């Protein structure tokens, strides 16, 4: 019952920013850690008012970590590394990754050596970067091989379909998703344009990344809500692995939070499992649900949760191997985020997230055949053969989803 959070990259670090901005007052503390329901799973005991979130903000070209420290973290565990991230996965893996992995894993095993008992890791990053992609992949590699009995969860922002912020980001995405496969037993994928449209629906003016990462932060908070807010029908990360991962390598999740508030519970539950409310733009029409976890929290009523079966027997489409009334991991938590009397999270193992994967595949299917940006990898130590086999693994995973329909 302890969480070590890993934050690599600018996107992952802003996700972490918003994540603790809401997690601190979700337990009644300010952003700086001052006191204004076992909340010690995320936080280490340092001072009676300062409950320190032990999360490593390791990131090449730090830049943003300065504005992170301006909300107080543990300054010893985090590092503002010498810059030079670029958007190269190999540059975060073996060029400058090899000169930071010893220090970051010394920090990590010092953080977990003082742990009474650990459940796993929740890493927030973006697969499309160069720091959060390559450094995250290296951390996954040397963290699975160090603690094979622990359960790494990755909250990765997949690059947007409509427009791109990096010109080599599908290379990075695929060659980090391969490491997420080979090194983690759980993954929640985030898509940016879905977050933009959700925040457009939620608010009345134009949002930005801070609102998107607030939504992502609500997602991550409700992921572990049943673990740190013990009510009835508790949920654990081991339970997430057991009942959301039907096959050994199929552990990529799409997440929706509701509402977007003294709302009527049927509306909250039917809008929680809404095809347009999920935070990753995945394939719903042709896709089906493998394993949906409904984690409701706050002013939730057990009969209300269990009687909202209209949205499951009407809107939710399941695979052939799951029972019609099954496919639900139900969870109750006594505490919901503020502004919500009762709120809900849908964590779905779904076929349509493979569509997410395949769009990166599509980009890789046009770049590798044209020798597009591969010299940036070859001169950095990552050859074309390992990129090809990483894409082969990712395509096999997407085909596993397509076969699991």
């Amino acid at each position: 019952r302890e969480i070590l959070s890993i934050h690599v990259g600018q996107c992952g670090n802003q996700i972490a920013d918003s994540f603790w901005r809401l997690a601190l007052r979700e337990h009644g503390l300010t952003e700086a850690g001052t006191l204004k329901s076992n909340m010690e799973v995320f936080f280490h005991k340092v001072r009676d008012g300062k409950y320190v979130p032990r999360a490593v903000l390791v990131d090449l070209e730090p830049g943003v970590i300065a504005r992170i420290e301006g909300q107080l973290f543990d300054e010893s565990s985090i590092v503002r590394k010498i810059p030079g991230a670029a958007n190269n996965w190999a540059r975060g893996y073996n060029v400058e990754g090899e000169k930071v992995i010893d220090q970051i894993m010394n920090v990590i095993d010092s953080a977990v050596e003082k742990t009474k008992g650990l459940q796993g890791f929740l890493m927030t990053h973006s697969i499309g970067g160069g720091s959060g992609s390559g450094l995250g992949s290296l951390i996954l590699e040397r963290l699975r091989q160090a603690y094979p009995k622990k359960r790494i969860f990755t909250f990765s922002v997949v690059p947007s379909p409509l427009i791109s912020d990096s010109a080599v980001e599908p290379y990075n995405a695929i060659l980090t998703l391969q490491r997420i496969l080979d090194n983690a037993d759980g993954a929640v994928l985030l898509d940016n344009e879905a977050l933009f449209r959700i925040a457009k629906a939620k608010l009345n003016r134009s949002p930005n990344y801070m609102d998107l990462n607030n939504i992502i932060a609500l997602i991550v908070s409700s992921v572990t809500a049943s673990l740190r807010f013990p009510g009835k029908l508790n949920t654990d990360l081991s339970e997430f692995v057991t009942n959301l991962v039907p096959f050994p390598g199929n552990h990529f999740l799409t997440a929706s939070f509701a509402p977007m508030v003294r709302t009527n519970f049927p509306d909250l539950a039917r809008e929680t499992f809404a095809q347009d409310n999920f935070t990753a733009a995945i394939d719903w029409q042709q896709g089906v649900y493998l394993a949906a976890s409904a984690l409701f929290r706050g002013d939730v009523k057990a009969k209300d949760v269990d009687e909202n079966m209209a949205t499951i027997r009407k809107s939710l489409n399941y695979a052939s191997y799951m029972p019609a009334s099954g496919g639900l991991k139900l969870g109750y938590a006594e505490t919901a985020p503020e502004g919500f009397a009762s709120s809900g999270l849908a964590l779905v193992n779904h076929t349509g997230i493979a569509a997410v994967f395949e769009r990166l595949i599509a980009q890789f299917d046009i770049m590798f055949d044209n020798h597009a940006y591969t010299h940036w990898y070859e001169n950095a130590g990552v050859s074309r053969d390992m990129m090809a086999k990483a894409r082969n693994q990712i395509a096999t995973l997407a085909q596993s989803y397509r076969d699991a329909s």
Binding site: N38, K232, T242, N243, K303, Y321
Partner: protein, 414 residues
């Protein structure tokens, strides 16, 4: 001194139902549940030694609680205070998480020796133990796995002590874990093999029983565990109260009157009256929906029914005639004519001045398990969620054997 009964609770549903169970039992005996000490100037009503013990002193319950995650045990401690012995409370961290194999071969194996150290410590303090009640949900992982390991090692090392199980089944309205079919079938095998008897609950049945028939627009699981608690209090009142007109019924005698054949030992239960705090009440006990399971038992076939009344009895010949009249229009098996055990308790429950509990053996429960087995036909035709069962220690052939044993039970019913 009277025959003893140790209630070991495993898993979240088992531990919370047990918390409510000894809450209501203590307030039936006049004992404060949140403290564990008797009320000053008030003697414990009935045979306290059957389910409790004078620990010097306090009227402590003889309850063993184990859960592979700390949250449920901590919640039970917060809602119950110093009622239970902290030594009898055993907790782990990582949990089982819907995985039977964790509680069977894994963390369950390493947590087992301390659990039975506390168990045989408790049973050595018993005068003449004649039953052990295992309160759990077989839908979950910790509940199923450690209920299996615990009852199996009991029946291999003991075996003269009857075992009554009280397992919460998955609701056909909604599942709470997607591996509930796995856990339920895996623990159902050992309930058949090891446990001498089993009691079955179902959540959404209690929901519809507590929504319109309790006047709450949306009851929580607290009211469901409260209904199960009323059921258990009525059932164990035969083991808890003595006197002239009332009859004492041990869990072994209840076993004998409820279990004609070794494999026919899964029980249904119902409670009456269905009103917030006689012939209409007689039919209220035996309504098609009054049972605490999602089925209609009146198209099934009652093997044997223990009808335990508790409260004032002003019309005992008229009520016996009412039971005789109702027996004509109820589905009873021809091979046991003495299928009605009419148990009496002078002291009623706290909620009602007079109440009855039905504890029946019916064939319909099999079709209930069959739909769970039907759910097992979905997760096993595709080999889904079974990687971690293999990784923790179970096998393809072992799972096939366990499912075949569950089917053997279902076909033994019909």
């Amino acid at each position: 001194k009277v025959n003893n009964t140790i209630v070991v609770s495993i898993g979240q549903a088992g531990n919370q139902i047990a918390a409510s169970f000894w809450k209501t039992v203590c307030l039936e005996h006049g004992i404060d549940p949140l403290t564990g000490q008797t009320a000053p100037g008030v003697a414990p009503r009935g045979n306290w030694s059957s389910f409790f013990s004078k620990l010097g002193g306090s009227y402590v319950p003889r309850a063993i609680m184990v859960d592979l995650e700390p949250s449920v045990i901590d919640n039970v401690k917060a809602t119950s205070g110093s009622l239970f012995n902290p030594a009898n409370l055993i907790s782990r961290t990582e949990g089982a998480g819907g995985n039977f194999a964790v509680g069977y071969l894994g963390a369950g194996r390493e947590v087992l020796p301390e659990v039975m150290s506390r168990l045989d410590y408790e049973i050595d303090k018993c005068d003449n133990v004649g039953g052990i009640i295992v309160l759990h949900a077989i839908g979950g992982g910790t509940g199923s796995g450690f209920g299996a390991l615990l009852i199996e090692s009991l029946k291999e090392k003991y075996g003269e002590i009857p075992v009554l199980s009280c397992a919460v089944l998955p609701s056909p309205q909604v599942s709470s874990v997607v591996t509930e079919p796995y856990n339920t079938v895996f623990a159902l095998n050992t309930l058949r093999r090891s446990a001498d008897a089993c009691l079955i609950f179902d959540n959404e049945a209690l929901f519809d029983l507590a929504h319109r028939k309790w006047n709450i627009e949306s009851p929580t699981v607290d009211d469901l565990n409260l209904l199960i608690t009323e059921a258990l209090a009525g059932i164990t009142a035969s083991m808890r109260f003595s006197g002239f007109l009332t009859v004492e019924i041990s869990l072994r005698e209840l076993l004998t009157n409820l279990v004609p054949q070794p494999s026919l030992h899964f029980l249904m239960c119902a409670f009456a009256p269905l009103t917030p705090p006689i012939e209409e009440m007689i039919k209220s006990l035996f309504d098609n929906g009054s049972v605490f399971a999602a089925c209609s038992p009146m198209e099934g076939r009652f093997l044997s029914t223990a009808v335990l009344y508790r409260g004032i009895m002003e019309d005992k010949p008229l009520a016996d005639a009412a039971l005789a009249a109702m027996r004509e229009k109820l589905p009873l098996t021809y091979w046991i004519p003495t299928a009605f055990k009419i148990g009496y308790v002078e002291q009623p429950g706290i909620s009602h001045r007079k109440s009855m509990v039905l504890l029946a053996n019916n064939t319909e429960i099999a079709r209930v398990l069959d739909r769970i087995c039907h759910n097992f036909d979905k997760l096993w035709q595709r080999k889904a969620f079974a990687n971690w069962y293999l990784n923790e220690g179970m096998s393809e052939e072992q799972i096939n054997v366990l499912r075949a044993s569950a089917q053997e039970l279902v076909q033994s019913y019909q």
